[PDB]
From a paper:
In contrast, IgG3 contains a uniquely long hinge formed from a triple repeat of 15 amino acids that introduces 11 disulfide bonds and three O-linked glycosylation sites on each of the hinge polypeptides. Due to this long hinge, IgG3 is the most flexible subclass, with longer Fc-Fab and Fab-Fab distances than other subclasses.
However, in tomograms of IgG3 bound to antigenic liposomes, elevated platforms 22 ± 3.5 nm (SD, n = 100) above and parallel to the liposome surface were visible above the Fab domains. The elevated platforms and divalent binding are therefore both enabled by the flexibility of IgG3-hinge region compared to IgG1. Our cryoEM model of hexameric IgG3 Fc platforms revealed the location of K326 on the periphery of the Fc domain, within the CH2 dimers.
Numbering used by the authors:
A (entry chain B), C (entry chain D): 288 to 495
B (entry chain A): 288 to 494
Write the structure that this text describes.
Amino acid sequence: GPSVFLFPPKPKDTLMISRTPEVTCVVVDVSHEDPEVQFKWYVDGVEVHNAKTKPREEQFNSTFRVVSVLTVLHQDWLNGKEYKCKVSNKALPAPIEKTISKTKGQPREPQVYTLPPSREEMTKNQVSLTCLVKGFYPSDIAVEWESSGQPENNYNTTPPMLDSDGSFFLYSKLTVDKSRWQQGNIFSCSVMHEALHNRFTQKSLSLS
Amino acid sequence: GPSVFLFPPKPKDTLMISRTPEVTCVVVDVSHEDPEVQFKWYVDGVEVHNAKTKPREEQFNSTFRVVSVLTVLHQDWLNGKEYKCKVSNKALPAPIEKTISKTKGQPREPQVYTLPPSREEMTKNQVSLTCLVKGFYPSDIAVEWESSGQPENNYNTTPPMLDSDGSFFLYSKLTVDKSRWQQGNIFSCSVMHEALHNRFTQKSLSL
Amino acid sequence: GPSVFLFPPKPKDTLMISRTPEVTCVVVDVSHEDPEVQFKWYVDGVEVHNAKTKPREEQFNSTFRVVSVLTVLHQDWLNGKEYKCKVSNKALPAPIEKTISKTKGQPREPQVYTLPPSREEMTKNQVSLTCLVKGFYPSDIAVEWESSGQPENNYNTTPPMLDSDGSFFLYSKLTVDKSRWQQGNIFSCSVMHEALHNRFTQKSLSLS
């Protein structure tokens, strides 16, 4: 029978009110004999009607994929409210229900560090700048290499590896041509996260 | 039916002078009705028998996994010699051949960069010294913080991501108490790689 | 009857992978009645077939000299693996076997010191600079007077003479006309050795 997957909204969408966060319920392996899929949506057990079902799409295995989206309230998502998707399809023995909420775990304020390039790296054409974002939880975050609060041309961001502190860390590799760094630009790495003051922080960088 | 995968030697095997690299040919999904798998190995198309076929292994899907390995020489691997694995099995429609050599693409001498800790990082008890390794190609790499050209060890290593220069980069997160950085330790970092002098170069850092 | 000599590869060839190190088996005093010499080669007792026999050459004593060369692996030579040459000739009562490996003895990191010329030597046309390479063992080494890592015009290298520390030392006499030194050029003695990090170290020198 078909299977159902439920995706969270983008972190920024949950943190920026001028944005709309939504959860996405994806149903795969729906059969052609019974392609109709009913979606019912609930926020912490209360049915809401601002959810919408996306068009059904046939998959490589000759089954249908059916998706429903529920708009979620900023307050509901950031406070960790639970959003339930109910999926019904005749190729299912029982309706499938899936719940999602703000990515599980206690929020942690990201510690944003901007590691300068190696002194020996000035002999090379292009130097790397290194936004260490550590001590942040959940992975719902935005990490924002910048100059003086204005995002940068080129950063090659590592995965959220776990740091020496049990948080996620990543490096955003703000890789900059030698003149940019050597001249002492005030780069900055900003980071957007629920646990930050402003849900948004800015930690600068310059030849130092 | 069966599938064959041919793996290069471990990067440090190809890159550490003291090591002997070998290539490993893995065959999965060999059937039980015809479990016999023939491995023939070739170096630059010439069949060799210093290659060895590993034991057949039953997968949970009621198939067999069969593996053969061929030792490769430092200069041979680094000079791009081609090592070919020929796999035959009756559950295959035809024999499957795979060849492996130094990972194809322009080699680049790794630029080894003990990046200093962030000024912003001095607020914490511990700071990260990052041995950026950039400008290297292939990903066939080994990375190694150091001090005075001798190793350091609380380095994380990121993946060989792509760098802006069209190479791989990775960051080697040595992470250390703030005092070590502020005290002006002569750290270093080595990187072992085919394009390097002695395939191994070391770059130092200190405050 | 004939005699056999086995020579090691050049140190640099063993330390630079982009180089190929080889061992050379030399057979002298081979007779003219039986000039044919068979060479068999083994690496740590395992016969290899990437060895080659050089052309036979008649010596001053009216005997033949026959030579065989075996390419050696970087790993094999630097790890001290043993390479055996088997020599057969009818003018021999029994085959002659000779083994060679990385020059015998415990590796020691070369200490590279660049001694400036005498203060009184500026009164003379041309001053000497003194690359003291000490604490290095074995003699498999490359010693490299330079400027800033780029080899120099004129160093009169003094022998591997044993030092106060039981290593070989040598000077390399980077003799330089007075203006080069007096102006404070960053000369440099580098030194390549198995015991060095990178098998290769670089030391500056300047008027100091």
